[PDB]
Design a protein around this ligand. Structure first.
Ligand SMILES: O=C(O)CCCC(=O)C(=O)O
Ligand code: NI
Length: 312
């Protein structure tokens, strides 16, 4: 038989870097919770129902793929803190590309949320050069107003700031008609687009995602309907659901106040891999479960912020 070996575990961070990294993602989460009452409420409801067991499966971010404002503007922060780039996903109809990142080894975490197992990171970018000339010019205008803001995307994310000037409503309107993703990013920037609860790490009966979905719906919240409320990967091992994004009033730079999408929250179940079929269920750890993401699922979860879902 050919020589075989297990995968090399990723390096762990030194103690200061690990601590510091967690204060940063904690600040990203603070902005997110302050602007997304639905996500904040659901996280409180799960904690009360299940106990202190909430783990974050992944964080997701959106970006403009032009002039260095894209995936790389955030990825460098995470790779400075030991994250490893993984698979690239393509979304041709929506004109998006995404990369996900797996965390450094962190087996000694002592808490939950950002103090629990470190989350994967999912970062997408809009392929701006594929849009109409008019939208390319609108995006380029804001990118010019931002200067070297792209070199400090994490500062922007931790503080809840846009690096470009505040948009005028007319520009938001034009982008909304061609790319809802572009419109989302114009008004939200590098803000955390969602966190994800790892349901299989819960202890109570809502650890099953079908039970979890009914728990959310019975507390009055609406799940993303597109492609069904439960997106199931073709191998059956990655099952995902998400809320409809919250909305907020935004005063645009020309004085007009209008509704915009903020963020949402996702729930994900990763099932055991087939080679570990007969593992006793008390023996399953995260590395025994389906890792990564699935283009089919992701394509429909992007629509949690779409106007059709928000106006259902
Ligand atoms: O809406 C976004 O920005 C990311 C949607 C994709 C995703 O997070 C997943 O596949 O779980
Ligand atoms: Ni997600």
């Amino acid at each position: 038989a050919a020589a075989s070996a297990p995968p090399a575990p990723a390096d762990a961070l030194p103690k200061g870097a690990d601590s510091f990294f967690r204060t940063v993602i904690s600040n990203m989460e603070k902005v997110y919770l302050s602007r997304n009452p639905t996500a904040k409420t659901i996280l409180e409801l799960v904690r009360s129902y299940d106990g202190d067991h909430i783990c974050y499966d992944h964080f997701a971010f959106r970006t403009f793929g032009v002039d260095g404002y894209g995936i790389k503007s955030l990825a460098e922060f995470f790779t400075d803190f030991g994250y490893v780039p993984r698979e690239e996903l393509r979304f041709p109809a929506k004109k998006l590309r995404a990369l996900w990142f797996s965390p450094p080894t962190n087996d000694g975490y002592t808490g939950t949320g950002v103090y629990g197992p470190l989350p994967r990171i999912f970062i997408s970018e809009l392929l701006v050069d594929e849009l109409s000339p008019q939208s390319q010019d609108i995006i380029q205008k804001y990118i010019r107003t931002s200067g070297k803001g792209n070199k400090h995307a994490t500062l922007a994310s931790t503080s809840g700031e846009l690096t470009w000037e505040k948009p005028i409503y007319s520009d938001f309107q034009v982008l909304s008609r061609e790319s809802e993703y572009a419109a989302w990013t114009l008004v939200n920037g590098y803000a955390l687009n969602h966190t994800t609860i790892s349901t299989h790490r819960l202890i109570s009966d809502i650890r099953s995602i079908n039970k979890f979905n009914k728990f959310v719906e019975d507390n009055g919240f609406k799940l993303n309907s597109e492609g069904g409320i439960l997106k199931v990967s073709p191998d059956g091992l990655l099952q995902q659901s998400s809320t409809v994004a919250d909305s907020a009033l935004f005063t645009f730079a020309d004085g007009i106040t209008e509704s915009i999408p903020r963020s949402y929250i996702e729930f994900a179940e990763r099932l055991v891999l087939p080679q570990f079929k007969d593992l006793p269920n008390d023996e399953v750890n995260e590395h025994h479960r389906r890792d990564g993401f699935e283009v089919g699922n992701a394509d429909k979860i992007f629509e949690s912020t779409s106007n059709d879902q928000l106006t259902r």
